[PDB]
Amino acid sequence: NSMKNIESLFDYSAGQFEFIDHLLTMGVGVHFAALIFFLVVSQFVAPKYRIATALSCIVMVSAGLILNSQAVMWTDAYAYVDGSYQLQDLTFSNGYRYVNWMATIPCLLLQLLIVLNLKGKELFSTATWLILAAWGMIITGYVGQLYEVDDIAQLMIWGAVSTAFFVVMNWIVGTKIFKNRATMLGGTDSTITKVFWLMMFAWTLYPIAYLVPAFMNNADGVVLRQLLFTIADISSKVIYGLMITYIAIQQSAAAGYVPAQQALG
Ligand X SMILES: CCCCCCCC/C=C\CCCCCCCC(=O)OC[C@H](O)CO
Ligand Y SMILES: *C\C=C(C)/C=C/C=C(C)/C=C/C1=C(C)CCCC1(C)C
Ligand Z SMILES: CCCCCCCC/C=C\CCCCCCCC(=O)O
Q: Which residues bind ligand Y (CB under 6 A)?
A: 101, 104-105, 108, 137-138, 141, 159, 162-163, 166, 203, 206-207, 210, 233, 236-237
Q: Which amino acid is at 14?
A: A
Residue nearest to ligand Y (CB): 141
* Contact partner, 101, from ligand X, ligand Z, ligand Y, none, Cβ < 5-8 Å per class: ligand Y
* Separation of first and last alpha carbons in the chain: 52
**Does the protein bind ligand Z through residue 228 (CB under 6 A)?**
no
**DSSP-based helix, strand, coil % in the chain, nearest 5:** 80, 5, 15
Interaction partner, residue 51 (ligand Z, ligand X, ligand Y, none; CB < 5-8 Å by kind): ligand Z
**Binding site partner of 68, from ligand Y, ligand Z, ligand X, none, Cβ cut-off 5-8 A by kind:** ligand Z
Instruction: Select from 56-64, 160-168, 186-194, 220-228 the region that touches ligand X (CB under 6 A).
Output: 160-168
The answer to whether 165 touches 134, Cβ cutoff 8 Å, is yes
Residue 140 to residue 133: CA distance in whole angstroms = 11
Residue 17: closest CA among 211, 222, 215: 222
Interacting residues of 38 by C-beta distance below 8 A, sequence separation 6+ = 53, 54, 56, 57, 60, 241, 245
Q: Determine the size of the site formed for ligand X (CB under 6 A).
A: 27
Among 43, 129, 152, 208, binds ligand X (CB under 6 A): 129
CB of 227 to ligand Z, least distance (A): 18
Q: From CA 71, how far away is CA 231, in angstroms rounded? A: 16
Please give the residue ranges that form the binding site for ligand Z (CB under 6 A): 25, 28-29, 32-33, 36, 48, 51, 68, 110, 123-124, 127-128, 131, 152-154, 156-157, 159-161, 163, 207
